[PDB]
Amino acid sequence: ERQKVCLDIIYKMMPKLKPVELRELLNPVVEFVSHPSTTCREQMYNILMWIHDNYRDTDNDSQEIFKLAKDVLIQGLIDENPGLQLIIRNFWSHETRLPSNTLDRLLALNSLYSPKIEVHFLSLATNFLLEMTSMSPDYPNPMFEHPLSECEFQEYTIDSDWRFRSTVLTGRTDLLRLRRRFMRDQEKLSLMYARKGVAEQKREKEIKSELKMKQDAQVVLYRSYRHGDLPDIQIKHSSLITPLQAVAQRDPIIAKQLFSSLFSGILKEMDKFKTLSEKNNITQKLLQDFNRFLNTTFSFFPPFVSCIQDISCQHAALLSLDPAAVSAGCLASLQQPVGIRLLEEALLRLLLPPDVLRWVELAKLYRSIGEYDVLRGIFTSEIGTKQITQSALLAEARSDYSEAAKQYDEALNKQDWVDGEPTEAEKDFWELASLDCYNHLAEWKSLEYCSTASIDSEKIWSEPFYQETYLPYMIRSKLKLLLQGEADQSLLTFIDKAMHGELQKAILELHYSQELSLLYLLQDDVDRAKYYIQNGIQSFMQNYSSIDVLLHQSRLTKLQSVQALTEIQEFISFISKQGNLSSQVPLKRLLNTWTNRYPDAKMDPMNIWDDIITNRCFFLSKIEEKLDISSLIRSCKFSMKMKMIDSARKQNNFSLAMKLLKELHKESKTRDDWLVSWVQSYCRLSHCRSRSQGCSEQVLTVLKTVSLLDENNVSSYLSKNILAFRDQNILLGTTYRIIANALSSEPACLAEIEEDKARRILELSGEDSEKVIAGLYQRAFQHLSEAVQAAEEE
Amino acid sequence: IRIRVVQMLGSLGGQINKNLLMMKSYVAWDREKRLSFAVPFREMKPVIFLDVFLPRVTELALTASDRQTKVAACELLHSMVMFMLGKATQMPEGGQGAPPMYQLYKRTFPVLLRL
DNA sequence: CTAATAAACTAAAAACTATTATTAT
DNA sequence: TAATAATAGTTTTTAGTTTATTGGG
Numbered sequence: 001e002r003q004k005v006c007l008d009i010i011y012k013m014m015p016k017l018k019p020v021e022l023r024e025l026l027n028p029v030v031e032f033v034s035h036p037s038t039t040c041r042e043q044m045y046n047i048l049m050w051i052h053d054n055y056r057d058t059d060n061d062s063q064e065i066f067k068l069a070k071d072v073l074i075q076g077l078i079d080e081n082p083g084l085q086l087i088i089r090n091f092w093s094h095e096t097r098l099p100s101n102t103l104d105r106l107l108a109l110n111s112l113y114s115p116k117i118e119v120h121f122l123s124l125a126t127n128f129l130l131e132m133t134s135m136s137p138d139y140p141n142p143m144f145e146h147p148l149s150e151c152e153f154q155e156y157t158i159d160s161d162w163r164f165r166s167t168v169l170t171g172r173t174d175l176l177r178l179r180r181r182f183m184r185d186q187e188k189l190s191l192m193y194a195r196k197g198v199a200e201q202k203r204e205k206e207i208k209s210e211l212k213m214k215q216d217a218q219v220v221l222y223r224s225y226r227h228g229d230l231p232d233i234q235i236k237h238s239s240l241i242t243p244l245q246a247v248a249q250r251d252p253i254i255a256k257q258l259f260s261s262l263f264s265g266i267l268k269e270m271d272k273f274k275t276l277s278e279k280n281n282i283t284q285k286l287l288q289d290f291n292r293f294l295n296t297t298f299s300f301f302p303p304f305v306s307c308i309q310d311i312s313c314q315h316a317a318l319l320s321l322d323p324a325a326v327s328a329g330c331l332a333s334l335q336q337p338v339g340i341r342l343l344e345e346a347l348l349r350l351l352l353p354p355d356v357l358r359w360v361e362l363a364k365l366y367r368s369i370g371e372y373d374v375l376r377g378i379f380t381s382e383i384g385t386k387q388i389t390q391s392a393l394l395a396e397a398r399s400d401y402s403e404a405a406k407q408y409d410e411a412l413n414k415q416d417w418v419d420g421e422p423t424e425a426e427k428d429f430w431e432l433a434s435l436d437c438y439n440h441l442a443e444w445k446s447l448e449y450c451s452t453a454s455i456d457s458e459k460i461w462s463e464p465f466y467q468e469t470y471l472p473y474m475i476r477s478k479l480k481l482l483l484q485g486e487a488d489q490s491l492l493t494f495i496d497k498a499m500h501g502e503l504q505k506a507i508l509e510l511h512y513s514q515e516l517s518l519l520y521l522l523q524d525d526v527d528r529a530k531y532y533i534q535n536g537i538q539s540f541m542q543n544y545s546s547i548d549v550l551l552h553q554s555r556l557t558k559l560q561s562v563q564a565l566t567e568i569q570e571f572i573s574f575i576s577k578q579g580n581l582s583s584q585v586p587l588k589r590l591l592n593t594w595t596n597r598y599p600d601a602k603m604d605p606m607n608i609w610d611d612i613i614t615n616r617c618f619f620l621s622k623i624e625e626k627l628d629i630s631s632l633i634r635s636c637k638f639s640m641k642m643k644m645i646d647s648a649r650k651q652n653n654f655s656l657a658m659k660l661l662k663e664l665h666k667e668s669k670t671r672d673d674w675l676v677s678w679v680q681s682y683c684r685l686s687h688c689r690s691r692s693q694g695c696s697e698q699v700l701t702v703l704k705t706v707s708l709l710d711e712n713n714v715s716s717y718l719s720k721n722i723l724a725f726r727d728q729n730i731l732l733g734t735t736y737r738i739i740a741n742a743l744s745s746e747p748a749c750l751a752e753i754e755e756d757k758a759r760r761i762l763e764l765s766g767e768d769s770e771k772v773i774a775g776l777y778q779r780a781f782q783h784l785s786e787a788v789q790a791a792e793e794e
Numbered sequence: 795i796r797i798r799v800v801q802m803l804g805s806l807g808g809q810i811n812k813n814l815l816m817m818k819s820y821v822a823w824d825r826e827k828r829l830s831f832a833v834p835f836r837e838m839k840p841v842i843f844l845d846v847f848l849p850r851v852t853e854l855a856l857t858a859s860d861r862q863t864k865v866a867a868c869e870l871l872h873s874m875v876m877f878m879l880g881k882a883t884q885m886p887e888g889g890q891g892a893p894p895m896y897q898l899y900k901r902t903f904p905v906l907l908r909l
Numbered sequence: 910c911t912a913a914t915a916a917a918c919t920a921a922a923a924a925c926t927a928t929t930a931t932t933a934t
Numbered sequence: 935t936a937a938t939a940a941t942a943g944t945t946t947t948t949a950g951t952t953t954a955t956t957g958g959g
Contacts, residue, residue, distance in 0.1 A: 102837060136834040144880045195934060199935075219862045223869050233880030237834060240877060243870035250863040251854060257846045262833070265840035273838075534797075541800050552815055559804075559811050566804030598807025608808070 003032070007043040014047070015054075019062040022051070026065065030072045038081040045084070048073050049091055074114045077124060093128055102266055103282070105129055110289040115503075118297045118304050123255045126248040129262065130241055142234035149230050156227035160218050222246050252546060256307040263311045283317045290318075294325045298503060299510045300333035302546055309335070309342050319346035324425070327361035328469070334547065334554040336365045359383060360425045364432065369553065372397045386411065386422050389430065399653045401437035405446070408434035428466065435473045440653065442610040444484060447477030459497050462504055472512065479515055480610075482522065483618055492519065509535060514565055517572075518615065521622075526572060533569050537562065560600060560608045567597065567612065571619045581627050588623065592636040599640070601647045609648065613640050638674060642681060649685050656685065672716045676724070679710055683731050687738070695742040699751045699758060703735050706761055726790035729783040736765075736780035740773045796859070823849055828887065828895055829878055844874055848898070852905045868909070875902065 010029065014022060030048075035041055048069050055066040077092075079085055092098060098108040109125050117124075133139060183191070222242040226232055248255040271279055290308055297305070309326060312318035323343055330339030343358045343365075359378060366374045372393065379390040392407035408430045411422075431454070438446035450473055453461075461467050461474070478491040495516070498504045509516065513536030520529035544558055578585060596616060600608065617640070620633045641664065648656055661682055668675035683703050690698055707728070715725035739762070743752065747769050751758055765779060766772035803811055824845050832841040851874075855867035878895060886892035895902075 100836070102835065133833065133835060136836050138834050143877060144884065146884075148880070148883065192934070196935085199934085216861060219865045221865065221869055223873060225872075231876050231879065233876055233883075235873070235876065240870070240873040241833075243866055243873060246866040247851070247854075247863065247870050250860070250866055254847060254851060254854070257850075258842075261842050261846060262840065265833075265842055269838055269840040537797065537800060541796065550820065555815075556812065560808045562800055563804040563808045563811065566801040569801060570805065597805060598810055600808030602809065603812075604808050 003035075003037075003040050004043065007040055007047065011043065011047050011050070014051070019059060019065055023061065023065050026068065030068070033072065033076055038079065038084060041076070041079065041081075042084055042087060045073070045076060045088065048076070053096070070112070071114070074112050075116060077114075078117060078120065089127065089131075093132055098128070100132070102129075103270055105132070106263075106266070107282070107285065110286060113289075113293055113296060115296050115298050116506075118299060119252070119301050122252060122259055122304055122307060123249045126255050126259055126262075127245050130245045130248075133241065134238075136237075139237045142236055144233040147230075147232060147234050151228040151230040151232070153226040153228045153232045156225045158221060158225065160220070162212065162215055162218065252301075252303045253548065256303045260307055260311050260314075264314050267315060280317070283315075287318065287320055291322050291325060294322070294329050297329075298507050300329055302333040302335050302543070302548075305329045305333045306335040306338060309339050313338070313342050313345065316345075316349050319349050321346075323358050323361050327365055328465070331365055331368045334551070334557075336369050337551075340365055353383060356383060356385070356423055357425050360423075360429050364429055367393075367433065367436070385419065386426060389426070392433075396437065399440070399651070400655055401440045401653075402655050405434050405437050405441070408437075432469065435470070439473065439476065439607055440605075441655070442480075442606055443657070444477070444481045444486075447473075447480050450474065451477045459494070459501055459504055462498070475508075475512065475515055479518065480614065483518065483614055492523070495519070510539060512536075513539070514568065518568065521572065526575065530569075530572060533565065533572070537565050537569070540565070556604075560604050563600065564608065564611055564615070568615055571615075576626075580623070584629075588629070589632075592620075592632065595639055595643060596636060599643045599647065601643065602650055606648055606651065606653055609644055613637075613644055616640060634670065638670075638677075642677060645681055645685070649688055652688075654689065661685075672713055673720065676710075676713070676716065676720075679708055680724075680727060680731065683707055683735070687731065687734050690738055694738070695746050696749060696751060698735070698738050699742055699749060702739060702758060702761065706765075707732055707735070722790040722793060726787035729787035729790065733780040733783035733787065736776050736783065740776040740780065743769055743776075744773055823898065823901060828893075828898065829881065831877065831881075844878065845898075847874070848902075852902070856905060856909060875906070 007029075010025065014025075017025075029044065032040060032044060051065070051069050052073060055062055055069065057063075073088075077085075077088060079088075098105050105128065109128065113121070223239045244258070248258065290312065293308060294305065309321070309330070312321055319342065321342070323346065326339050326342055330336045340362050343362045347355050347358045363375055363378060366372075375393050376390060376397075378384070379387075379393070384390055388407055388411050392404040392411075395407075396404035411430050412427060412434075435450050438450050450470075454470075458464075458467065458470075462471055475491070478494075482488065482491060495508070498508060509532065513532040516532035517529040517536070520526070520532065540558065540562055544555065544562075547554055547558070549555075574587060574591075578587075580588070599612065617637050620636065624630060624633055641660075645656060645661065661678070664678050665675065665682070668678045686698070686701065686703055710728065713719075714728060715722060718725060743749070743762075752762065752769075762772060762776075766775040827843050827845060829845055830841050830843050832839050851867055851871055855864055855871055858864060878898075882892075882894035887894050890896060
């Protein structure tokens with residue numbers, strides 16, 4: 001009552017006010033959007049449309065009032081009440097707000113944008129541009145004046161029910177007013193009991209009514225259907241446009257391509273009769289509009305960004321967007337390759353070449369998609385100013401990120417430039433590639449080096465666009481730092497101040513909510529962690545609905561993401577629900593089982609990997625601190641880490657966690673089996689370590705101390721399976737073969753020339769190199785044979 | 795239902811989950827724009843092509859949740875198919891005497907019959 | 910050869926608002 | 935099914951001690 005009367009106050013009194021008092025009054029008013037009652041919402045909408053119409057021109061402050069009014073209107077273009085949506089659509093669709101010309105409608109919809117309704121603007125624009133197409137003379141008329149043949153096209157009605165298939169097998173009324181209240185020959189409290197009983201039956205009637213209403217609302221069609229034996233082509237244009245706009249408001253992607261088609265067709269029809277000067281000027285206006293759209297958006301919905309860059313693709317004059325903006329949108333929204341063609345054709349049309357910006361953007365996007373061939377195929381050109389970048393990328397093509405990080409660091413720290421200073425974009429490439437390779441270098445030290453507050457002293461560290469790129473890397477660094485058993489509260493304070501500021505907080509939940517969930521688990525804020533994680537998973541599955549089927553790789557990455565999401569949510573789904581302090585439920589004995597579910601081997605790069613193990617170990621730590629069991633959790637993490645190192649060796653990320661392996665050996669003396677398994681892991685890794693310099697490399701470290709002198713308990717004195725025994729025989733024969741081949745290929749190696757313990761052990765295992773290679777080949781044959789007879793014993 | 799699906803799907807295993815996805819499974823549905831439609835207007839009228847719509851609306855009305863979306867997409871595709879057959883009967887093209895949407899017929903008849 | 914006692918002191922109860930459950934249907 | 939009638943919460947006296955204050959004998 002009071003809110004409604006106050007809005008009516010404002011509505012009646014504001015037509016007699018100064019702009020300054022209006023701007024004073026609107027700030028404590030406009031925020032009443034998202035009020036639980038809708039009626040106040042359309043009341044303020046009436047106020048907003050009034051001032052919108054009254055403010056058109058002058059004073060820049062009244063113009064600011066006008067800007068804020070259209071802003072609150074356009075963000076009001078979504079309401080839960082469909083009637084509000086209908087009335088605002090009717091208001092905006094009028095010729096005054098949006099002029100009836102199609103190109104006028106286009107420029108008007110360009111004039112309006114909001115960063116938050118970027119999900120729905122495509123559908124809204126399609127609805128605006130199609131429902132307006134209703135005053136065309138042929139619009140009620142059928143498309144085809146001819147029928148197929150003679151037939152009776154009687155209408156075929158269609159039913160509708162909440163039930164589905166597979167449910168059943170087989171003042172003239174004064175008599176009423178005169179007889180309404182003849183209470184006199186009745187009792188009062190008996191009538192009271194009747195009234196309250198009737199109230200009770202109405203209560204359970206409401207109960208069953210809401211039980212029925214639990215299901216979806218009844219589906220309504222949008223086109224009358226006639227019936228006949230021959231199809232009736234002669235049907236109105238409404239019959240196809242109305243389902244088209246309906247499904248456009250249903251699905252975003254179909255709205256995407258139909259919007260693209262209508263945009264391309266309308267431009268291809270407008271160009272035929274307008275002067276080239278006006279068409280050109282309109283084209284730059286559009287280009288500015290799209291640049292504004294991409295700069296202002298934050299939640300990069302793949303359909304919207306992809307459709308705007310796609311409609312820019314079809315027109316040569318539209319190949320002039322801010323290419324860095326295009327690159328950022330494509331990488332963030334995972335719509336990369338089409339934007340790659342955008343950059344390519346913009347380069348192609350533009351034809352001294354300053355295209356280094358397009359080059360660097362396409363190169364970083366190709367690095368994002370994973371491949372490396374285009375990178376070198378491009379930077380082998382003279383346009384590549386710094387060949388250090390080319391050398392770094394070709395050398396890390398074998399997943400050698402350490403040297404690439406070294407090259408990036410020395411390049412950014414190379415102040416002198418005899419060949420000319422590199423462009424800012426090239427240095428941005430270098431630092432972002434260093435960030436990505438450090439992300440591959442799963443250790444927290446690389447992450448801290450990322451978080452070393454880069455040059456120019458870089459919420460405080462969020463506003464510039466370079467910082468926007470760093471924020472995911474920065475927070476990933478911070479969480480990997482803290483979750484491993486570290487505490488600084490700097491990240492907590494940062495996200496607390498990031499709550500202040502709607503845009504920063506908004507982007508961090510809409511993209512990175514599981515980070516909030518995990519840190520709230522760190523603070524034991526299980527409720528808000530659950531809220532964040534459910535928000536993340538539902539938003540992400542919505543994105544999976546949004547992404548197209550062609551790009552398998554993005555869907556794969558999303559798949560691994562939601563895999564990690566489900567392990568963390570099932571962890572939070574079992575904390576003390578049954579009560580777990582001394583109740584040794586098999587759940588703990590079951591969650592570790594199946595190798596603590598599938599670790600997703602042989603693919604799924606290392607960031608998935610270390611996230612999985614880090615969260616799992618932090619979990620089991622939380623249980624054991626809130627609950628022989630330690631032996632079980634140690635064995636579990638042992639298995640986790642062995643699967644890790646084996647898979648990452650299969651990943652050929654040969655810059656493995658060396659010191660992690662060293663400490664695995666260091667406290668590998670839990671039982672013999674554990675240290676034995678570590679020994680086989682290390683020796684197999686060194687076996688795979690053979691490379692171009694695998695000759696000198698393998699002869700300098702011949703499985704360190706010759707299989708680490710493992711000749712004490714083979715298969716734990718054969719007490720284990722002889723499959724293990726045949727495994728060590730295989731490894732020993734393998735390293736014998738590698739050394740013998742290395743010596744045969746390089747009889748004059750420096751290491752064998754060098755008088756060292758390697759010389760002693762090689763002559764022991766063997767004078768002349770021929771005798772040594774014959775002896776080592778004999779030993780290799782012997783050990784491989786031993787593995788062979790140990791093999792057949794199943 | 796959907797949250798259960800996604801959570802347990804993740805719980806299965808990522809490479810195991812990969813089995814949801816080899817002749818590349820898509821190139822195009824036509825070698826040229828065999829079908830087009832001119833949207834009317836009070837002013838001049840541009841031309842739109844249904845071919846880009848055809849496949850994705852086909853699976854969208856084939857199988858999905860949100861029965862409202864299913865019904866709306868079905869109604870749209872029925873209006874679509876009536877319009878395209880009428881256009882084919884209107885002015886036949888060449889190449890096979892009249893292959894208007896012949897390959898497209900080969901694609902649409904299976905989806906029509908299974909829906 | 911041993912005091913009412915004036916003042917100080919806390920206690921206790923009434924007066925005046927004083928909104929706040931509280932039935933009817 | 936949705937009202938109004940009891941109705942506590944601050945001042946403010948006032949009795950109820952208490953005292954610490956003399957000369958009594």
